[PDB]
């Protein structure tokens, strides 16, 4: 497909940029940096970088402009999964058949590596060589990532989740959890790409935000559906869940009304998800 090729391009590109970030500045830090590299360079699909690049293109920006954005959102993502894997959280020994970072190294080193990955996400955005936007735009990219990654966004979502165990969530509560835990960062990926284009305007930003809201949820619905083929199918029944995923794809496509052909990657992604 066109989307398969777009994904593969985004993945090669961001991977090359990320791989360069993990050189220990001195010998004593080698194992720390190897854990950082292990936590990031793990064959992930890089959906968040794809979204940054595609949002950048949708507004007419050359995609290399979003390199730093793409790296930052992937760094946030990766750190979040390392902390999530720990015994006090999800306690996961394996991710796609490979040991998780605390299992491959040790729990302290995993905690620290991921802590350093979060810092690096911000470092890369603030670095006007790696992220060479107008300074006001660099700051807005930082602001948006920090809000989305923190306790009002992704980390907050993780807290809502742990605070809902043993409660039977209704759909509205489930969606509140998803919008925080995964939606904030998806939205920030699109927002930061769009900002990197050097052509953002408030109307186009608001429309891309509607797009992102839609596809973020659509990812979760469809994930639950593929698991079958407190979940969307369990709440709704399998068939109504499938209908809901199509509704989300339609909201996503509608948000892109008026965009030029250079938004086709975002349209194609919305279809691919469902």
Ligand X SMILES: O=C(O)CCn1c(=O)oc2ccccc21
> Site residues (CB under 5 A) for Cl ion?
271
Going residue by residue from 13 to 32, which x/- string records binding to a copy of itself, judged by CB under 8 A?
------------x--xx-xx
Going residue by residue from 36 to 65, which x/- string records binding to ligand X, judged by CB under 6 A?
---------x-x--x---------------
122 sits near a copy of itself (criterion: CB under 8 A):
yes
CA angle, 101 then 44 then 154, to 5°: 75
Cα dihedral 148, 217, 79, 17 sign: negative
Of 4, 8, 12, 119, the one binding a copy of itself (CB under 8 A) is: 119
CA angle, 103 then 70 then 259, to 5°: 140
From the annotation, which residues make up the binding site for Mg(2+)? Answer: 84, 90, 92, 94, 220, 224
Give dist(CA 199, CA 197) in Å, integer. Answer: 5
Contact between 113 and 32 (Cβ < 8 Å): yes
From the annotation, which residues make up the binding site? Answer: 84, 90, 92, 94, 220, 224
Contact between 254 and 270 (Cβ < 8 Å): no
Residues sharing a CB contact under 8 Å with residue 270, sequence separation 6 or more, in sequence order: 211, 214, 215, 218, 249, 252, 253
47 sits near a copy of itself (criterion: CB under 8 A):
no
Residue by residue, DSSP assigns 124-172 as HHH-TTTS-S-HHHHHHHHHHHHHHHSTTTHHHHHHHHHTTTTS---HH
171 sits near a copy of itself (criterion: CB under 8 A):
no
47 binds, options ligand X, a copy of itself, Cl ion, none, Cβ within 5 to 8 A by partner type? ligand X
149 sits near a copy of itself (criterion: CB under 8 A):
yes
136 sits near a copy of itself (criterion: CB under 8 A):
yes
Contact set with a copy of itself (CB under 8 A)? 25, 28-29, 31-33, 36, 83, 86, 88-89, 106-109, 111-113, 115-120, 122-123, 125-128, 135-136, 138-139, 142-143, 146-147, 149-152, 155-156, 158-160, 162-163, 176
């Amino acid at each position: 497909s066109m989307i398969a090729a777009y994904q593969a391009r985004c993945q090669a590109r961001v991977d090359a940029a990320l791989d360069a970030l993990f050189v220990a500045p001195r010998e004593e830090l080698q194992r720390l940096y190897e854990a950082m590299r292990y936590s990031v360079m793990n064959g992930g699909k890089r959906v968040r970088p794809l979204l940054a690049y595609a949002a950048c293109e949708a507004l007419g920006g050359a995609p290399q402009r979003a390199d730093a954005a793409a790296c930052a959102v992937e760094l946030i993502h990766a750190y979040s999964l390392v902390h999530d894997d720990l015994p006090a959280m999800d306690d996961d020994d394996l991710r796609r058949g490979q040991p998780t970072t605390h299992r491959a190294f040790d729990e302290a080193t995993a905690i620290l590596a991921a802590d350093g990955l979060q810092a690096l996400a911000f470092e890369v955005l603030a670095d006007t060589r790696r992220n060479p936007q107008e300074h006001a735009v660099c700051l807005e990219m930082l602001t948006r990532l920090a809000r989305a990654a923190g306790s009002a966004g992704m980390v907050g979502g993780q807290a809502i989740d742990l605070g809902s165990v043993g409660v039977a969530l209704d759909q509205a509560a489930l969606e509140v959890m998803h919008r925080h835990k995964t939606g904030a960062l998806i939205e920030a990926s699109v927002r930061l790409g769009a900002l990197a284009s050097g052509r953002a305007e408030p109307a186009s930003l608001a429309a891309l935000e509607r797009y992102a809201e839609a596809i973020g949820l659509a990812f979760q619905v469809q994930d639950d559906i593929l698991d079958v083929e407190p979940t969307y199918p369990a709440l709704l029944g399998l068939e109504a869940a499938k209908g809901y995923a199509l509704e989300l794809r339609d909201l996503a496509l509608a948000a892109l009304d008026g965009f030029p052909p250079s938004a086709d990657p975002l349209r194609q992604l919305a279809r691919y998800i469902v």
